Amino acid sequence: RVQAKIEMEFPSEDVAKVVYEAVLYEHLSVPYRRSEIDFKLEGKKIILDIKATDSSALRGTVNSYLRWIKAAIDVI
Amino acid sequence: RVQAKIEMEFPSEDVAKVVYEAVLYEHLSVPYRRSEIDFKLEGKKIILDIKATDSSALRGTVNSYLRWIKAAIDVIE
Amino acid sequence: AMDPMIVLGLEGTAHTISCGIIDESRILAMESSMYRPKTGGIRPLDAAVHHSEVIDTVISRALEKAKISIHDIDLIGFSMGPGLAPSLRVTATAARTISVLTGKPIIGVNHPLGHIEIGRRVTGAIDPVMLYVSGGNTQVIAHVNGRYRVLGETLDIGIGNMIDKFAREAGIPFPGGPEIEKLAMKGTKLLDLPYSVKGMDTAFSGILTAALQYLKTGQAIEDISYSIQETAFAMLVEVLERALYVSGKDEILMAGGVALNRRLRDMVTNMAREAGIRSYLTDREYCMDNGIMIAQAALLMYKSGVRMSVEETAVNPRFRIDEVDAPWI
Ligand SMILES: [Mg+2]
């Protein structure tokens, strides 16, 4: 099994707010779990905690979330 | 700046050795980073330590390495 | 005695991931897994991932093919040659591991070399001129100064893409090639297309735009499609003829996805009669990317003493074919 932990800081604490919200709505929409994800909001910093069976499975998960996040930011 | 840290355990300590080696050659091979990565071997577990500017950069880097390790793993198997 | 020396080849520069196994006299095994993007055009990051998941099953189904014991493999040649970064590193890595897993040596092969040597092998040509016509590659190459030298080439667009970006502008599924091949059949007249040969080099942008402009003019398509073939293949037939009677040789080889064109084969074997030199039409299947053409180009390298410890190995997306010494003709 693989372990993953990401953290990205934002300019202000409210940008984190908005974003987390945008992704969190997506987190909750997700039907499948090729891996388990733990979503959390910190200071001006969102935190990810993934646990995959394999590395390929871990990979695709990260692409989803990391691709959701760049989505948020960029609109903003 | 984003921060990343990945760990995957292998059945035995030597499988770890092998995969490390295989991918280590690739680590060194690369000319241009779209982010800064730190490669390490532990017990039977390889460690990744990434520092990227944005989330689109970090992502691509991860995809690379994670694809490399799945290559090594699958060959051995 | 020195047992029949066995090699295993890994090709993975573009979209095809394949693994071959041969020895001096045999072709024990070989199968590929092509990444088929229903879309069309280059898709690098998607390609590597394709590979990454099926590279496992190719190299392993192969061993079963050759029905040879895993201990029996002697060398391990991968395609470090020119290509797409994501894919090359996947192949490179996979090999660097198999070499360890099976405990044998390893060398990096150049990609187009394999096309020559596998074609040369399959036909029995001693020192031919090669017509490399793949994706974005229009190459005419020959062994001259103890190394394979590139003589002429496309200065704009690889003939294969000009073909496909017309299909993908004339509304056609990305199986572009053959769709226009078995289309130029019902071509009645020949329209006019910018014929650009200059030395042994060529240009294709001209052909395309002049073809698209004819398209909206509301011309026929079978006519346009028909004209483009005869006009561009005309440009290759000339360059070829020239390449021969420059480096002075008496044989030809066609390699690439373009090289599978029924009419192109004709326009070549025809020039053969008029040039007085053999037009070896390579096995119709070895024209696409295969892992085994790598094994063949490695075999030759190792046999002539060229070797490289694992550390030295690393991909090279910009690998000139005249960068490798080919001292065996
Ligand atoms: Mg090719």
From TrEMBL, chain B:
Gene3D superfamilies: Alpha-D-phosphohexomutase, C-terminal domain
InterPro entries cross-referenced by the UniProt entry: CTAG/Pcc1, KEOPS_CTAG/PCC1
Domain of life: Archaea
Alphabetized Pfam families for the sequence: Pcc1
Family, per entry: Belongs to the CTAG/PCC1 family.
The name this protein goes by in its record: KEOPS complex subunit Pcc1
